[PDB]
Amino acid sequence: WEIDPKDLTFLKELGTGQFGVVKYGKWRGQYDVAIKMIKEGSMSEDEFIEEAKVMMNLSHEKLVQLYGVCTKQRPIFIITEYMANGCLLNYLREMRHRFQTQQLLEMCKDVCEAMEYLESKQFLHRDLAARNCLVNDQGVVKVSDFGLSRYVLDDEYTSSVGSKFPVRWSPPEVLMYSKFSSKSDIWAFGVLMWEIYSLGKMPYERFTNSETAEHIAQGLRLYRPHLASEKVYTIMYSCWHEKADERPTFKILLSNILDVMDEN
């Protein structure tokens, strides 16, 4: 849906992402929004515009909503829901001494609900990770920038040997064959759970990307974080089966997480 740029008020800089500058503003003077200004050359724009209706129609409380676009000028804009506490990865690190384990499990539930919804729509995120989750003013985690990796023009990001490719969140079949599926999102979700329970540590820290690929291909897996119970670790570990068809669905993962909450 085409937003009238006259309805947007820019208020604050939010930094730079894969597609360039992002700003905080308001729509019609009332609703907080983030406005991506798509840097020319950074996105396959014709392809995104051609395919963007499905993305806007994804509607779930735990997705950072894509409200609309402005495409009748350059640079084009993507207008999304605004999340006052920013990126989950920074949020985990800034509050790491305060979180209770129940809050960490709730963050996992938030993301799993969003991914179950995307799964039910046969829609792949493709770059699920704590850096691509956001946190609102009440501590609710939502999944951000689902699907946009498909439109990135940046060889360092699109090549599996590039420095920006999400190697540490990728299953073997992505690293070897670029086989993206629901089950590669499952693998990434497990790594995300690990990020949450490690309070924002880098997966496979001190390994390079290629060393990470080599060693997960040989069965190396992330260790259990101190704050993860055995039941919680069993959930994240189930996401890392070498064979994609042995990995659970997000429906099953959500059931597992709710069972742990009930027991607690």
The catalytic site residues sit at: 127
Stretch in the footprint of ligand V1G (CB under 6 A) among 126-134, 206-214, 225-233, 252-260: 126-134
Say whether residue 89 binds ligand V1G (CB under 6 A).
Answer: no
CA angle (117, 122, 127) in 5-degree steps = 80
Nearer to ligand V1G by C-beta: 129 or 235?
Answer: 129
Stretch in the footprint of ligand V1G (CB under 6 A) among 109-117, 147-155, 230-238, 246-254: 147-155
Say whether residue 192 binds ligand V1G (CB under 6 A).
Answer: no
Nearer to ligand V1G by C-beta: 152 or 193?
Answer: 152
Say whether residue 134 binds ligand V1G (CB under 6 A).
Answer: yes
- CA dist 68 and 3 (Å) reads 6
Ramachandran class of 182: left when φ > 0, alpha when ψ lies in -120 to 50, beta otherwise = alpha
**CA distances from residue 104 to 125, 194, 232 in whole angstroms, order as listed:** 22, 10, 10
CB of 259 to ligand V1G, least distance (A): 31
Say whether residue 152 binds ligand V1G (CB under 6 A).
Answer: yes
236 CB contacts (<8 Å, ≥6 apart)? 190, 191, 193, 194, 197, 222, 228
Amino acid found at 107:
M
CB of 158 to ligand V1G, least distance (A): 10
Nearer to ligand V1G by C-beta: 8 or 228?
Answer: 8
Strand partners, 22: 36
Say whether residue 149 binds ligand V1G (CB under 6 A).
Answer: yes
- 18-47: contacts with ligand V1G (CB under 6 A): 18-19, 22, 34, 36
The encoded tokens of residue 127 equal: 């770059």
Stretch in the footprint of ligand V1G (CB under 6 A) among 68-76, 146-154, 225-233, 235-243: 146-154
Neighbours of 122 (CB within 10 A): 8
Nearest to 240 by CA among 168, 178, 177, 179: 168
Which residues make up the interface to ligand V1G (CB under 6 A)? 14-15, 17-19, 22, 34, 36, 64, 80, 82-86, 127, 132, 134, 144-145, 148-149, 152
